[PDB]
Amino acid sequence: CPLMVKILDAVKGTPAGSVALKVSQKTADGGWTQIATGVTDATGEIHNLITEQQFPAGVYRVEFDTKAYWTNQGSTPFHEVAEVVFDAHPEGHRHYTLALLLSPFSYTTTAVVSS
Amino acid sequence: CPLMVKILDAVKGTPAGSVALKVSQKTADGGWTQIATGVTDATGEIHNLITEQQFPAGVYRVEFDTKAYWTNQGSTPFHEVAEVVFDAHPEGHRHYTLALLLSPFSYTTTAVVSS
Amino acid sequence: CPLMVKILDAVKGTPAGSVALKVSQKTADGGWTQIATGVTDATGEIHNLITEQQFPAGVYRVEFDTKAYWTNQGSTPFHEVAEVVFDAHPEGHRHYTLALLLSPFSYTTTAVVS
Amino acid sequence: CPLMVKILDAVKGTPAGSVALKVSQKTADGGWTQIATGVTDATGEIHNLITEQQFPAGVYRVEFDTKAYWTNQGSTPFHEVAEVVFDAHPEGHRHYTLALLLSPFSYTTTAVVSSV
């Protein structure tokens, strides 16, 4: 998998399960084309989100539905969504891991880029 | 000021100065209307970024040009941009400070919301 | 004020008020000795924590009592405490701000140095 | 593996490899008794740091030598060390992962605790 995620819940100290996310690719005209959507499992990850064939070089946006994550827990969050925008160069089997630490009024997005 | 920012540089241990940002407002049709731009001073802040007349209830987007900040610093950044997206005055009018902690491959967005 | 703090609460999006902390100095022995205490006001700050005379060059440990903070909020924390250890050089009116972002199972420590 | 770590480098976007750490166990008198040391591999993890028998309920301290890490990376760090202190109830196959995100002037410590 060239694009992976790892979401953690900073209130309970567990992975963030059942977070919905969408992957969008920026096109020539500057617009965004949705190319995939998924939901984290109980470990805060998604497997088989997009193939290397679906993941050419270019700018991508990954939108995490963090508001619903907190609302379904009875907490009231600040952010509508968490969006991670980055220029990708999957070359030489270069893989990207988007880590995300969630609190109701704050989140941290970091990237682990390999090969 | 109803909308303040406070950007810090986690590499240098200083406020992030001269960071450019845009403030947008979600519209009825689901698009975005830009309402302001700004650039942080040397304390990492923008004074009088918007006024109360520009700030009715609704969803807003604050887009920080973090990639240009790290390029001018000589570092190579991951993120194309840093986006904070939130519903303003959902339960009534409030004031907002957006705290942002910047590293080349990571950032933390936090909100301080007061009456 | 050569040593300042700013503590935020990431659960409810406010400063963290009434957080107790201890400032310790490292001894030439190798251990710690407590030189001051304080408690954050409603803005997550402590004014007049220590003086420039109490804050000479040297290694310092600031120990934030985050466990008691989350207990008094009704939450279960992970950390027994939040410690920040750094080498201070207040040379040339150089001031330190320890920014601290608190969640029950996580905290971020960062420093702003003039 | 009841006590695991995961360290990342927020500047380069890689795991922080070759970080030294010391595991200490609070004693009845309040002192600390070192019980283990380790160094992260290239994934930012340490495997078989301590056994479940070495890890009874109690207060533990994990000290990460982040000053040496940043110096070797060519950056001047703020912190002398990163210290994670916590009360552990490892009853019923409860595992602790100490997650650590590092920048020269900032770090974030989080914990992931598995269920019994």
Ligand SMILES: O=C(c1ccc(O)cc1O)c1ccc(O)cc1O
């Ligand atoms: O612990 C984290 C982590 C990240 C990537 C990964 O492959 C495994 C992890 O445990 C982690 C998650 C979110 C964050 O903001 C920082 C982290 O170190």
Ligand SMILES: O=C(c1ccc(O)cc1O)c1ccc(O)cc1O
């Ligand atoms: O110290 C911070 C801060 C936040 C709000 C404010 O009005 C002033 C501050 O110094 C701060 C804390 C966490 C963070 O991710 C970014 C910050 O600027």
